[PDB]
Design a binder for this molecule. Sequence first.
Ligand code: CA
Ligand code: CA
Ligand code: CA
Ligand code: CA
Ligand code: CA
Length: 126
Amino acid sequence: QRGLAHLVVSNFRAEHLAGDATTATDAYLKVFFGGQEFRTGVVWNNNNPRWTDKMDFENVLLSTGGPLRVQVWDADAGADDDLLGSCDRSPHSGFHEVTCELNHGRVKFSYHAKCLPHLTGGTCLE
Ligand SMILES: [Ca+2]
Ligand SMILES: [Ca+2]
Ligand SMILES: [Ca+2]
Ligand SMILES: [Ca+2]
Ligand SMILES: [Ca+2]
């Protein structure tokens, strides 16, 4: 079947975040694709957080599996957290570096969408 690709998202890092008023940001990420939802740990009190996580989505429908969505959240340990911003990309085959400009600050990451063997093209349809 066509449209299949191995998706891996990695190299997470943000800068100039402002999720709190009296302390530095307590950031964590949510990464969405094809019904899958990965979550990073919280980097407490840092406005330039980095995550070592490498998310293996395995084989997904690159063409119809919706957008790759990255949400940047601040953690307020008093229950309700803050959505600092969200990024949407339509993944293409190959290695790509992404920069999402949030309302305040930005998040950077990379993803690799490797077409399954005997498949080729931007979304592995050929
Ligand atoms: Ca907050
Ligand atoms: Ca904080
Ligand atoms: Ca917080
Ligand atoms: Ca909470
Ligand atoms: Ca809050």
